[PDB]
Amino acid sequence: MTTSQKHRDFVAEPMGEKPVGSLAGIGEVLGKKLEERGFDKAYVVLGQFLVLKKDEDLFREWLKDTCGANAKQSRDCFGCLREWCDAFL
Amino acid sequence: MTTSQKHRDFVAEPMGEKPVGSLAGIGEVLGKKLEERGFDKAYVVLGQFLVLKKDEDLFREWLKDTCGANAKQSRDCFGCLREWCDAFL
DSSP states (O other): OOOOHHHHHHTTSOOTTOBGGGSTTOOHHHHHHHHHTTOOBHHHHHHHHHHTTTOHHHHHHHHHHHHOOOHHHHHHHHHHHHHHHHHHO | OOOOHHHHHHTTSOOTTOBGGGSTTOOHHHHHHHHHTTOOBHHHHHHHHHHTTTOHHHHHHHHHHHHOOOHHHHHHHHHHHHHHHHHHO
């Protein structure tokens, strides 16, 4: 139901060292799982997106299989990360 | 002996989809080895640098162990990729 202001805020300015849970689609509980998986910061997760050549099917299985995110949560991270790259990459 | 103009050209404008061998420190022969390793484009190699949290010792072993680059060639890619991130990340 309408994206949060975080989506426009993230693709409106550099990401710097913001925490992983700052990425749109990742909640406080999910941010903790990615952190246990070695992604304590967003740019480390951005790297995984870059390693998958922006492949949406591979990206979705990675997040869901890695933490259990739902199909709705994965759609927000794909378009959210894909849009940041369009402005910064 | 003095860096090539490619170093200043790469950190002077976005990287887009330039080929891997376009990264400073990677020669035409080495670009072919990375390509056989699955890195047909520079942004895929940029992702590995991001996944290593910019760790220089881990990055150097990755390139040398992955293709056989010399210690001099690895120094150019670290500072070259590190400088691009400073301007675009």
